Amino acid sequence: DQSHWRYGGDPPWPRVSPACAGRFQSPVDIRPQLAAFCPALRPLELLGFQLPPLPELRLRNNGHSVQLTLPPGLEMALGPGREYRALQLHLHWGAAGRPGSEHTVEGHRFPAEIHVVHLSTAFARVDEALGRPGGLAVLAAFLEEGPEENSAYEQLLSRLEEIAEEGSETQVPGLDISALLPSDFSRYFQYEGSLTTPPCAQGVIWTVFNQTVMLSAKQLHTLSDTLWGPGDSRLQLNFRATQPLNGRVIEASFPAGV
């Protein structure tokens, strides 16, 4: 099986996909004081993210996260000339007493992280974009613990019980995908990295919101303690360690220093 891997042990990821031994991998530790302010980095523009209930969307436990398949027509602009089509979103989380975001900020790990994965409009096929500079783009936001339930996230978290078993899937109504993300589109970090799971292909443009999304502690428990993974254990701690920068400069869309 050329396509099986897990978090927390063998097979080593470079054996699954040699590209996971690359020099420009994700995730990374973001150090705001050392991020370079770039004023050409304009507010992100999201088109078509406010979905009606029909058509419904596939929601699947793939053993590695819960993944929501997005319909056609969702467009994300990093800028004019950097236009992307959204494919799917999924999440990374921890466990009882343990945060599980993938990116960190000055070494701080947040409770969880949402990824929205996009294909550059240059491509008709995700597989052709793998490893090509700017072929894929991921929008990432941190999920922080707060006192109030997040109603937008409850639409998905309340359905995880239906897909607890690995490989199981269900259909959920369309929802406002942009309500899963922060409201500030103007403050973000941006750098070039990789997919954070095998095949770990490089050339991915990462955009990480500076503003967090708040979930209740009960919601974060629902996320991290409902799903089962490969080989009968709870799907938890499904994040990768941060990776060497190897000379990369993380850019900021706002003066990030103090």
Ligand X SMILES: *[C@@H]1O[C@H](CO)[C@@H](O[C@@H]2O[C@H](CO)[C@@H](O)[C@H](O)[C@H]2NC(C)=O)[C@H](O)[C@H]1NC(C)=O
Ligand Y SMILES: *[C@@H]1O[C@H](CO)[C@@H](O[C@@H]2O[C@H](CO)[C@@H](O[C@@H]3O[C@H](CO)[C@@H](O)[C@H](O)[C@@H]3O)[C@H](O)[C@H]2NC(C)=O)[C@H](O)[C@H]1NC(C)=O
Q: Which residues are catalytic?
A: 64
Q: Is 243 in the site for ligand X (CB under 6 A)?
A: no
In the chain, helix, strand, coil percent, each to 5?
A: 15, 35, 50
Whole-number minimum distance, CB 93 to Cl ion, in Å?
27
Q: Which stretch binds Cl ion (CB under 5 A): 30-38, 67-75, 103-111, 155-163?
A: 67-75
- Interface residues with ligand Y (CB under 6 A)? 32, 105-106, 142, 210, 212, 256, 258
Residue with tokens 């990776």: 243
Instruction: Report the 3 state secondary structure along 22-52.
Output: CCCCCCCEECHHHCEECCCCCCCEEECCECC
CA–CA distance, 8 with 234 (Å, rounded to integer): 13
Q: Is 247 in the site for Cl ion (CB under 5 A)?
A: no
Residue 67 or 224 with smaller CB distance to its own copies: 67
Pairing state of beta strands 45-47 and 66-69? Answer: unpaired
Residue with tokens 């000339």: 81
Q: Listing from the earlier edge strand, what are the strands of the sheet with 104-105?
A: 29-30, 104-105, 108-109
Q: Is 106 in the site for ligand X (CB under 6 A)?
A: yes
Residue 5 or 185 with smaller CB distance to ligand Y: 185
Please check if 92 is assigned to a binding site. Answer: yes
Residue with tokens 């096929």: 125
Binding to ligand X by CB under 6 A, coded x per residue (else -) over 23-62, reads ---------x------------------------------
Q: Choose, by CB under 8 A, the member of 35, 41, 119, 160 that binds its own copies.
A: 119
Write the single-letter amino acid at 159.
R
Q: Is 104 in the site for ligand X (CB under 6 A)?
A: no
Q: Choose, by CB under 6 A, the member of 46, 77, 95, 105 that binds ligand X.
A: 105
